[PDB]
Amino acid sequence: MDAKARNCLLQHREALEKDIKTSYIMDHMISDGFLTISEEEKVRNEPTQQQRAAMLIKMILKKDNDSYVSFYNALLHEGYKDLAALLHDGIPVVSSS
């Protein structure tokens, strides 16, 4: 069992905040079935500062780890293999061991 992978998505807020900002990528994913769509109408105007993209990412892992694996394939479906590798490179092993 790799618990570090769960921390990768939680610590990937600074990477997604600059790369993927609360948009179709984050919305089309949550509405995909991971979390109820009712949360979308809330996040739209619930947050006010950077916390907006901070609660949207935590919500992904806050539900289950299965949604985290889908987001990796959802980005590779178009052309995000660059950033997608960043997450898939820390989920399994770190670097040395």
| 87 CB neighbour count, 10 Å cutoff | 20
Burial annotation 29-57 (CB, 10 A radius, 16+ → b, else e): bbeeebbeeebeeebeeeeeeeebbbbbb
What domains can be seen in the chain, in order of their start residue? Answer: 1-97 (1.10.533.10)
Method: NMR
- How distant, in Å, are the alpha carbons of 6, 23, 54, 82 from that of 41? 26, 13, 16, 30
Rounded Cα distance between 2 and 81, Å, is 22
DSSP 10-22: HHTHHHHHHHS-S
Rounded Cα distance between 35 and 92, Å, is 25
Coil, helix or strand at residue 86: helix
